[PDB]
Design a protein around this ligand. Structure first.
Ligand SMILES: CC(=O)S[C@@H]1CC2=CC(=O)CC[C@]2(C)[C@H]2CC[C@@]3(C)[C@@H](CC[C@@]34CCC(=O)O4)[C@H]12
Ligand SMILES: CC(=O)S[C@@H]1CC2=CC(=O)CC[C@]2(C)[C@H]2CC[C@@]3(C)[C@@H](CC[C@@]34CCC(=O)O4)[C@H]12
Lengths: 259, 259
C-alpha cells in the first residue's frame, strides 16, 4: 500500500513562522499630498484612505495565512472585521520601530507623523498611545518573528459574544499560534527567562485591547459625524465600520485576554 | 531472545501526577502542650520542633520524587536546603485551606493558630502573610493536583548564584514540571481561560519569594539570638539554617521568577 503520509513534504514545508515572513504584505503608500493644509479633516481623511488600502492587503494575507482556511468562511470574515484596528495599529507601531527607531509614527513611507502632525490630526492622545507601544518594542527588542506571530494572535483576539460558527476550529488555530510564540521565546535552556519574556509579550498583546477600544471610540465618533467633521472614508472602511460599529457598541465584541 | 522491553510495565506505570499523590508526606504532629503558657518562646520553639519533623518527611519525599534522582546528588541536597521554607510555608497554607477553609493556620492537627496565637507567637505579620496565601487558594479553588506540581516547582525555585553542578539537568526537570502544570490547567479547549489560570498560578508561585524572604529574615534573626530569646531549634534546623544563613545573607540565593 502507498503511504499517504509524506515525510519529505512535512520536513520540507517551511515553518509556520517562515510562512508568515513570506506572506507579510509589502509596504503601502498613503498618497499624501503636502499641498493640502495639515488640518484634522485632511489628515484624518488621508489616514482613512491609507487604512482602506492596508485592509485590501490584510485580506490577501488572511487568505494564505496557515490554518485560517480551516475555519468556517463566515468565521474568517468575522475575525477580519472584528480585528482590523488591532492589526493596523500593531503594524503601525512595528513600522515606527523598524523605520524610525520609534521616534515617529510611520504610517507609510510618504506619511510620517512627528509631534506636530499628531497635534494637527486632532487625535494626539491616541497617537501617543500607539507611540508608547512602539517604545515598548525598543525596550523589549521585539523580533520580526515574534511580531508576525503576535499579529496573528491579534487577528484571533476578539470574537462575537455569542461565539463563532466553529469555536473548536478557532480554539485549535489560536492554541497552535500561541504554541508557536512559546517555542519562539525558548538555545541555552532557561525556563525562567523564557517565561518572563512570554509574559512580557502576552501582557503587551493584552494591552492592545484598551488602546484599540479607544481608537475605535474615536473612529466610530468621526464616522457618525463624518458630514459635520468633513472626514471622508473609503468604501472598504464604510463596509467594515458599518458592520462593526453596531456590534461593538451593543457589547457584542468579546476581548480574549491572557491575564 | 528475551524481550528486554516490558509493555505491561509501561502500561501500568502511573502518571507523574499520580506518583506525586502517592508520595505526598503523611501529616506530622507538633507535640504542642497546652499546659505550658502561650509565650513566644514556647510557641516558636514548638514550631521549630514541628519544622524539623516535617523536614524529615520532605527528605523522604525528595528521594522518590520523579526526576529528582537525575540531578547530581550535590544539587539535590542544595535544592532542598535552599527551598525548605518555601515548601513548608506552602504546605501550611494548603493544610489551612483543606482543613479550615483558610480560617486558621493549620500547622498540625494538634496546633492550629487563630488570631490570638498569631499575636502571641511574635510573628503576627508573617502569619498574616501565609494566611493571605491560604485565602488565595480559596479564591482560585486550587486543586490537589495543581498543588502537588506547584510544590515541586517551589523545590526548583531558588538556586545558587554561582550555579548548580548541572544547570542542564536542573533545567530539564524544571521544564518538565512546568509542562505538567501547563497541561493540568488545560480544559475540555479554551486557551483564554487556560492561560489565565496558568498566569494566576505562576503569579502565586512568584509571590512566595517575597513572603519566604521575610520568613527567612525572621528565622535567621531568631536563630542568631536563640540564647537571649530562649527559642530552641532541633538538630535538623540547626543543620539547615547553619548552611543557609550565610549563603542567603551574602547574596548567593538566586530566586527564579515566571514574571
Ligand atoms: C493615527 C491613526 O491613524 S491611528 C489608527 C490606526 C491606523 C494605522 C495605520 O497605519 C493606517 C490607518 C489607521 C487604521 C488609522 C485610520 C484612521 C482612524 C480609524 C485611526 C484611529 C481613529 C481614525 C482617525 C480618523 C477616523 O475616522 O478614525 C486609525
Ligand atoms: C508561623 C510559622 O511557623 S511560619 C514558617 C513556616 C512553617 C510552617 C509549618 O507548617 C512548620 C514550621 C514552619 C517551618 C515555621 C518554623 C518556625 C519559623 C522558621 C517560621 C518562620 C520564622 C520561624 C519562627 C521561629 C523561628 O526561629 O523562625 C516557619
Amino acid at each position: 500500500l502507498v503511504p499517504q503520509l509524506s515525510t519529505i513534504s512535512r520536513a520540507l514545508t517551511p515553518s509556520p513562522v517562515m510562512v508568515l515572513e513570506n506572506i507579510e504584505p509589502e509596504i503601502v503608500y498613503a498618497g499624501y499630498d503636502s499641498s493640502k493644509p495639515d488640518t484634522a479633516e485632511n489628515l484624518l481623511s488621508t489616514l482613512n484612505r491609507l487604512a482602506g488600502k492596508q485592509m485590501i492587503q490584510v485580506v490577501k494575507w488572511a487568505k494564505v495565512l496557515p490554518g485560517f482556511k480551516n475555519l468556517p468562511l463566515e468565521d474568517q470574515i468575522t475575525l477580519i472585521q472584528y480585528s482590523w484596528m488591532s492589526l493596523l495599529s500593531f503594524a503601525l507601531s512595528w513600522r515606527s520601530y523598524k523605520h524610525t527607531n520609534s521616534q515617529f509614527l510611520y504610517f507609510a513611507p510618504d506619511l510620517v507623523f512627528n509631534e506636530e502632525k499628531m497635534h494637527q490630526s486632532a487625535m494626539y492622545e491616541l497617537c501617543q498611545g500607539m507611540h508608547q507601544i512602539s517604545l515598548q518594542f525598543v525596550r523589549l527588542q521585539l523580533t520580526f518573528e515574534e511580531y508576525t506571530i503576535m499579529k496573528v494572535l491579534l487577528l484571533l483576539s476578539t470574537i462575537p459574544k455569542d461565539g463563532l460558527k466553529s469555536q473548536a476550529a478557532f480554539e485549535e488555530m489560536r492554541t497552535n499560534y500561541i504554541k508557536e510564540l512559546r517555542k519562539m521565546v525558548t538555545c541555552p535552556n532557561n525556563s525562567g527567562q523564557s517565561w518572563q519574556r512570554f509574559y512580557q509579550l502576552t501582557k503587551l498583546l493584552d494591552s492592545m485591547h484598551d488602546l484599540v477600544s479607544d481608537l475605535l471610540e474615536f473612529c466610530f465618533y468621526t464616522f457618525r459625524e463624518s458630514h459635520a467633521l468633513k472626514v471622508e472614508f473609503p468604501a472598504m472602511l464604510v463596509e467594515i465600520i458599518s458592520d462593526q460599529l453596531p456590534k461593538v457598541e451593543s457589547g457584542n465584541a468579546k476581548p480574549l485576554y491572557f491575564h
